[PDB]
Subunit: 454 residues, 4 copies
């Protein structure tokens, strides 16, 4: 239910901070992504005068997965490993051959230090990868009509940001709430469960208060009892947090009058209430607590991991919605996984008898097992072909284009690495955590190195 | 015997490149380090006019371990984790308290991007950390007499480099070979074993040919049969390789006349023989092979890992001598490890009955188990104190000052991370690898994520 | 009166933005600096527990000049040239010898890219250089009691920033206005003169509105006629601008109700009124004008010049108060300047007759003018000694410790370079510019290269 | 004849180092550039399989000038000012409109820190800019056939480097010496003149010795007397210097046997003779002199200026061949320059009477000079049109496409800035300097700031 990377004693936590959207309030990711895609697509032709055709682009949710990286320079989308090696790549929607991948990058690795790459985990990655993919396909068709790959990417990023602060996005959903947000009673039960154990919960969102009030009201209030209000659930509600800068920057707080919505500058320490802007530094101080006593839970890293972890110090946990289907798919592939595990053991011992009757014809003899081993080279190619098919069968249980989110080839993917480094704890959704005792001591499993003995 | 991080099919390898010193030719690390320390210490007072006292400094091999990082700015030596968190630190030889560590670094993490840190794995790290430690202790005592911490560090690094190219080091050992180099017959048997399977071996060292000939002659020739010569063992012997630049730079090759030692510039493709300088790019080309068909084995990363792995492409393996005692010590601590593993299981179930009779007095009741649980808080503190002692007993099996080389706290150390990223394969010594069949297929174990099922 | 670096046609300017403090409102720099110094000194011992002695530190305004650079790493203060060469340096208050300067920096140049250097022009540079100087003198005396040079510098910078947002500074002056601010009637006459020609003036300060209203009221209102108000002078008054980020960042605007001081978020284009925060991008857009139609005048570069000039595009001018005494001092040294100019011409022709009767004894003859020229070597040393004294006399007309602000040795100083690159136009004070016709076309003089002919 | 940026006392100089090619030995730049262009063009289609058409590309020497910068990312060539502002730009060979330039760069400035720009002054800049220009014109025509702009640029740079070390270039010229090298007797007379005054001259080239001997023999020997040899002219001749790394790097020296050409490693201090490789650090030391006593003269900055000036310390001078025509053209435009200078003075006083009868109709009156001034607005437009034509006439005296090399618009160009910062002294050719007395004291003219008085 809850996965541990680093120890975190919930008994030592006095405040739990929650991202409002996608963390505290769940959204139908498929609909939400589709919506953002349509708006950004529309906005491209409306303010950037992109080719008419794009309005006709079909949105396929499975065209991308979470954790992908795009290099704005070459209009490519890559799935990297934990150390930045290219597992697979596409130029637009056209896959790049391993051969040509190496000719393109002069290496199997890439350097994310190079800003020409977009490697930040964001809540729109998927939509942005799908639109960008087909967006560079158009570009190729008639280079003279559309800007450059790096220009296109910057444009899409701009539209994606504008629409979020434009009001465009929030309005469409605030009027189709039942379609975009999925309510969950367990969430309010969990918050009450934790508050009941002395925990103080606060939320910080990049959304304005007016819109935040409407949303919390719709997704929390209904599950409350008579005489209860969602406002009593949170010690603080920081709006327009301006994450990630909120964590390591120094932007000032604005006290928000919950009624009229007007604000005043903050003088002195902050007190339970509604604010806008701010920074973790001042907030941790005013609360008179140590950063290791504060736990923040978000849905996306949304920033550079080293600066976030070094320049902040709050314990950080992650909610990874894609985990739902990832786990589900692995449980489904169990029987297939087993059939290849045994088809490997056979290829192993069968390949072992091959080197044996091999380290003879040229280690003790000089010719005698010539035909003896040849029967193994054919019997080994057979057990191999079986494995290729069994692998095809396994992939069918995952995204057909990009495979799993946490795996890149057989090792952990670049995204798996980000979760591991950024999060001490991660789960599918917020309630998975609230299900546990507010005084739980989370322990990580012993990693175990290659030269370690059981 | 041989530890795998990434798959490497020895059947696909046509050339194996070996570092001469510390990889192909083993040295008594204790004596070798002591020697380098004495020379560098002496050189400091001789050319830099450092205080007289240093000549009287006592060398303690256990004062440092491999994988440590020094920040020249503050005269500190730190043991980092895989993600750069400070596990323990010393200012000189004086340990820094966790408290003061955070006050000093404003975080538990550090950023190795910051050049004020020395984080390269080198063959003198240990000696350099010991001398530097006591060297900043002197500095403190009378700040006016010695340069700054960052000045001192640069000076030591200079002496360490000068002595290696000075002739100072090579001469002392070339005259006490039996004391500094440990000969191993298995090494020549292994090389012959691999050559016998079609493998071409070449060596590349940062040492001059004249000195190289003397060393190979002394450590390989004796184990050879009548009519055999060590020169027939190697396809190429690149001298003054100038590693790591040899891998990613473009420095030119100089053909070396094995007799008189004179050189001529290279025109055209290189051929079996003796060279000086060079670069992997030209060498891989002339040999008409793919970089993934070449495997280089070294004893130290000795450079920036990303540039080395990205800008080269040869398969790279590592020989980690410290692995000897590390493994040996873990096997010795096995019984202790078991006694704490059980003393944990008890603290676990005992701590579980604590939250149980806890999530009652404030979840179903309001007061009743007040004294009931208090007996557990005392019984839990006891089973805990036992664990502290059992841990003291365990540490006694490792370096008393810095603990294990591959572990930082309970997770992998910064050095473990370097091995993993830089090496596809690693072992205690070269012969461990030559012991295997030249046509072995090395496979890495499935890593397994926190949300994976067995 | 007004100095031109780059052409700027005031006829093309529709809006002039002014920094409120030090630009629109003049302050007694001596008193203001002294005040900031005392507060920061006091704050060091109050919150950082610095040694008691500092409270007893004497403030000498002439101990520093504008344009100096401090390297936090070594506790040094340097006067650099246009290309970053060290003209003179001090460790604390102790001058460093040219000899030792080179031994310290391994070069006569430094690299400001290196963040260990503080090279930003700020309104407290002088006070900060004086306090820091004596602050590292204390550090030396007893290294164990005070933090490191780089720690000290960061502490001072912190105190300097805290006191500015603390209220500490603004309060002391708001209560001694007649002592800190120097009122000038010409300023209001000039603003009216420009407004009269269609120019729109706006101010943007890093000060809160409440304090801004008090200040403008005190320094502008008195010079106004019956029925006139200072608020009618400005189209916009952006408060807590958060410069320099205001120029290139994206921070949001907050509409400020001039009455109660409360704010609301901005929706749509900004309109004449009072705001807080903001960014030049949105502001330039809403006003429907090109950035080259907007001119901003400040008193300090206060940021990185390339990012400010590249990422903004507004025309930028600078007010350099130190220019007053600099020019005044040069006019005073005129007669001395002339006496050395002639004492040079003599050393020139006299040195020319030296090479003449020199390129003979070894170009036509071989010995004959041996004693003939020796009379010149003594007569040349004399005319030289006279020049050394005449130079001593000249320096007496400038800061005794650091010489001129715009000159470093004989070439332009590092600060001269900053003005030139950042400002198209610069003057001693704001009114110098308002004195000109609002429709003036400012032209820069032809620079002229070494190989150009008159 | 010789232009001074910074003082340099030739009496204090004990060694003068000279680049062999383009500095000591003059080449017909037009032929040399054309040759390099043809070889690189040919090499592109030969090893990179570039489109057949390129072989048919016509080389126009005037298509580029020295000092241009290319941004590999967008396939553009720009002429920058001293502070990096774009004076004019071309995409391939197609000029970019000021309008579109700003839309492309989001600013009038660019940041050369960004490695996507090629801003190093090299001896092939011109040829490379011409070929690259037409090379991206082809790319546009059929994007699918040629690599990307940044790929193309890297390819051209590769061909340009390969051909120089290939032997291709050196061979063609060594066989048409009379066509590519221009011999000058004054050069040998000057060297003898300086040697005669105690100066030691050494040369360092990136060319092999064998080729160097042939060239010096052909360009110096003929002008020598009976019994004289060019080898007696130089104290040291460092071959394959590997500039610029030679200056700041640490590459080792190889002693070269002038006879057979074979080398041996250097042990101890270097002595008069022939070497290969090396570094300025060791060389300055062995000679037992201060870097400020050594003067190096080159033809191109060929590297990063700050690292070259900071990490070396030798006095550096520059030979700028383009200076010939630049000066010549300015002397020719003198009469035109004068006709516009007077046509400006008139537009000035005429524009002054305009603001006068302007600061009345709205400063004293309100309407009266309505038609009075209108006669000036037409009379001012006329004197302006005359100026536009007079400017057209002036440009005709310079490169029609890029204007002057040292001027960008009216201020100094980016290249002028490089010369100024890198060179203390610069001239058209080496003999211009040797013409002066070996004991000359070079002084730079007082720069003079905008607020300085004559």
């Amino acid at each position: 239910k809850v996965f541990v990377n680093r120890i975190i004693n919930m008994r030592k936590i006095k405040l739990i901070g929650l991202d409002m959207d996608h963390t505290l309030i769940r959204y139908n990711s498929k609909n939400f992504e589709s919506l953002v895609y349509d708006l950004v697509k529309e906005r491209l032709a409306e303010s950037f005068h992109y080719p008419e055709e794009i309005k006709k682009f079909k949105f396929n949710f499975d065209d991308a997965i979470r954790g992908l990286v795009i290099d704005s320079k070459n209009g490519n989308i890559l799935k990297l490993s934990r150390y930045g090696a290219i597992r697979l790549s596409y130029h637009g929607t056209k896959q790049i051959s391993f051969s040509d991948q190496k000719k393109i990058y002069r290496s199997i690795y890439v350097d994310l230090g190079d800003p020409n790459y977009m490697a930040i985990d964001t809540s729109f990655s998927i939509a942005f990868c799908i639109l960008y993919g087909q967006l560079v396909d158009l570009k190729d068709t008639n280079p003279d009509k559309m800007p450059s790959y790096q220009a296109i990417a910057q444009d899409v990023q701009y539209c994606v940001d504008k629409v979020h602060s434009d009001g465009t996005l929030k309005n469409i959903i605030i009027k189709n709430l039942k379609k975009y947000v999925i309510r969950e009673k367990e969430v309010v039960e969990g918050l009450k469960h934790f508050i009941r154990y002395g925990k103080k919960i606060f939320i910080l969102t990049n959304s304005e208060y007016s819109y935040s009030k409407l949303l919390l009201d719709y997704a929390l209030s209904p599950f409350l009892d008579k005489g209860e209000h969602w406002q009593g659930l949170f010690e603080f509600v920081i709006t327009l947090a301006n994450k990630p800068r909120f964590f390591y920057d120094n932007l000032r707080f604005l006290s928000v009058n919950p009624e009229n919505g007007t604000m005043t500058n903050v003088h002195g320490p902050i007190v339970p209430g509604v604010y806008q802007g701010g920074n973790a530094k001042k907030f941790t101080e005013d609360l008179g607590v140590g950063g290791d006593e504060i736990l923040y839970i978000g849905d996306h890293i949304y920033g550079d991991i080293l600066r976030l972890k070094k320049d902040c110090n709050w314990r950080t946990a992650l909610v990874v919605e894609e985990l739902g289907e990832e786990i589900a798919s692995q449980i489904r592939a169990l029987p297939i996984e087993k059939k290849i595990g045994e088809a490997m053991a056979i290829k192993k011992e069968l390949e072992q008898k091959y080197v044996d009757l091999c380290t003879r014809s040229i280690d003790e003899s000089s010719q005698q097992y010539d035909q003896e081993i040849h029967d193994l080279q054919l019997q080994i190619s057979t057990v191999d072909l079986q494995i290729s098919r069994l692998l095809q069968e396994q992939n069918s249980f995952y995204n057909p284009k990009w495979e799993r989110v946490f795996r890149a080839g057989a090792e952990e993917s670049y995204f798996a690495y980000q979760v591991d480094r950024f999060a001490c704890i991660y789960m599918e959704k917020l309630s998975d955590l609230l299900e546990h005792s507010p005084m739980t001591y989370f322990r990580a499993n012993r990693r175990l190195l290659a030269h370690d003995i059981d």
